[PDB]
Subunit: 312 residues, 3 copies
Amino acid sequence: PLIEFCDSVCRGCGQVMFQNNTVTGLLFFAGIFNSTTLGVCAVLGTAASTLTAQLLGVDKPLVRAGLFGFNGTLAGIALPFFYEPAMLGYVALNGAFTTIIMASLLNFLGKWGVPALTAPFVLATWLLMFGVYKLSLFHPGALIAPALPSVAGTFMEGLFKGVGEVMFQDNIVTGVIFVVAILVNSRISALFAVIGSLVGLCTALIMHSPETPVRLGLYGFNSVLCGIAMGGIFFYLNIRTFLYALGCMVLGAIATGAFSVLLSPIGMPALTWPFIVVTWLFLFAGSMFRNIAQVPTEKAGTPEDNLRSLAI
Amino acid sequence: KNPLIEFCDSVCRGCGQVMFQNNTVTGLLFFAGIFYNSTTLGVCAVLGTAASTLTAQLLGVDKPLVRAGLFGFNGTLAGIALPFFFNYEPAMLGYVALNGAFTTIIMASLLNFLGKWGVPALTAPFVLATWLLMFGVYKLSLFHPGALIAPALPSVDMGTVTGRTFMEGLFKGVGEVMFQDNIVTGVIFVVAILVNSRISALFAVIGSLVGLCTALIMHSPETPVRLGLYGFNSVLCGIAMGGIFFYLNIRTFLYALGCMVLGAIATGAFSVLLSPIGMPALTWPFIVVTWLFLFAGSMFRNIAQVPTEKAGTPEDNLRSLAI
Amino acid sequence: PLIEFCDSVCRGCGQVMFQNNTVTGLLFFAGIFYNSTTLGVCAVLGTAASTLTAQLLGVDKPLVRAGLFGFNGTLAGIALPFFFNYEPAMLGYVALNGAFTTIIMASLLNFLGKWGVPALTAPFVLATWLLMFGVYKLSLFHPGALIAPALPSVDMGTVTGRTFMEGLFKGVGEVMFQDNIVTGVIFVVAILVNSRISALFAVIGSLVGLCTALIMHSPETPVRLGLYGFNSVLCGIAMGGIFFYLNIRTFLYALGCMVLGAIATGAFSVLLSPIGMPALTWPFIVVTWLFLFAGSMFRNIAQVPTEKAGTPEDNLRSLAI
């Protein structure tokens, strides 16, 4: 059981980039392990999420696939980033909430075979983070600030930072390591995750953004998930599939921004929100697309496996 | 019986269904509790409930549903809350009716909707209606709103905790579930819940209480706490996920507790979300965290979801299961 | 193919009022062309993009040729130019908007499909929404004075004959973001071609929206501006024999919905007021889908089978048996 919870926890981390591999997940943790605190709160979150599915009795295939620890980690991290004694507890409370969300979303999105996506991480964190201004147990970082919207008056730092900011990780190194981590399980996923941040970076420049946040990588977080997800994983990789991904990827950044305003008066983070909308938006469309070949979700595997299975 | 007596028998049932209790008596017992605070509010209630009821019958709902009172619950909270959170006018009544009726189409809309996975509608009909019916105020000056509403961007005194903060809050939580800021009714409404079922009355209690303490822990201004506001939703969570929608157990308990705890956080989060628009949160929080837990249940082996279409009192749900 | 893309484009425009007819659609374009060649272009651009896209992703030809894949394609071509200061990148973004609409519609199709609910203008919005929200942080475009961040807060102007006439037509036009009284007329006529019923219901739409606004006590500026007739017009046209077998009970439902349209219009205005963006078609699509999802549970109410739903007349002729 201990080794399984381990093997699960390791898998959930990789699933962050849709990669179901204990190794990639470990390789990912090693990358992020910028802050021992963050790593702890991560393992806490992942552990809670994992341990929870097992207590409510999920299909072992799902837990052991790590599908029940992914959003478990991002709740462990981001409640600390955006620290008190009650920080840990709330992390646990966040991760666990994620689990009910995922189920809730599972059955939900299931009946058309749409994935849950990071949506569990957010809608949780969202709720668990919104009530701060009225629940003074915690006190928030300078990264949060109520304000009505108002108009405003690099490639290397941003590239890596995009991949890291996917984990709220503002480190160039980990970004590299996380990219390498993605390589292990699959070269394809590591590449698509790259084009992700890059397609997000340039798309941001074009739309004319303050070259601060760009290098900060923020406009590469979601893009990186879009590239990794719609990259051979959820759809049989092709040329038309590529342009779709590019398409989505491009879309990712616009939505990132739009989402920043939407929550600007409430001044909270956008979080993974953008990737999960534009994503689910494209997915729900795929089946109607003849030219587009959706990968059967329940069977969807690595871009390579999804290409090897399809071959015959 | 008769149509008049049926509309009566229905109206009485819808009120109890507020706490998921399908009983003409509990519902009456509930009205009696709230009547204490405002004949006006009682009227606007009966108006709302009546409209909601009468509407389902005109669109032809399955009699089982109307007579189960399932078509009057959200009908009442629209009759009440358009009067409270707004300055009574002559058009107040009409709009109440307009609110209740809207609730009905919402419930249907949500019924077919949430139905195909067997999720309940929950108070969601009351809100999304009232929401729409209340949002456009600043631009539809027919009505003029109470001081309880105020546009403002979010921003981070403490007051003092005490015995009174626990007693006033405990009862006020149950009442604030009906937007009722009275300690007495809270008691009466608790008793009302006892009639139909001791279990539901107890869970509704743990509801407000789990909501009260959870609020203190998260560090809230000890004003609103005693005000009970952070007990409204919690009370519904305790009552709903308490043997009603899931076969009551120990694991089921901790789930409820879990949900209940979650209720308050969401209550707060929701307060912000609507703070710039400065409108009330209303039942909104319970209905989200709730539907969030429900949709999860089936995936949970250890968790035994009560078949919605069959879901009855925690006792009946335990007596039926016994076999 | 060129003539089909034409025949499709023409159809998508009529579908705006649920009318599947190349003629009505043309008649509609002619109406609106009157106000701005630019807007007409951005429209055709949008519609063209939306159409061309479904074909490249391979949609069922029945749907494209029914024009159901160009409707929301037009409103994205128009509104990115209106509620924003035209730039060179205006066109591109239009195209980017229309195309986005298509994935939205699919996304929503499969989505709302499994209960047979329509997509409605929801594709136009959720796109435009996203494509318009990030402006304050994506300074490529610069927005019109019609946009302004502000927390909500409670002059009256004066009601009059002109307030009813300017508003009546403006409601139908404002359904296309068209602030012209003429086109409103023409668009009404356009609706007549395909069907008298749809043209009438679209009328009752704006009118039910107009009065319902007065009653709720609104600043008699926006009313004549017609704004509170846009959504109402869609509600009347949609729930008018098209999506439900037209009757008496069906009428009161429509009226019902129609009345609801305006309240929601306003509420939606607040919801987006701090973010100070437009409400757009948003209101019609919520109160609408709210009523539709209810219909089946209504015995007295006879929902028209969506996949079969046609003109109020055809929906009455088919039913006759």
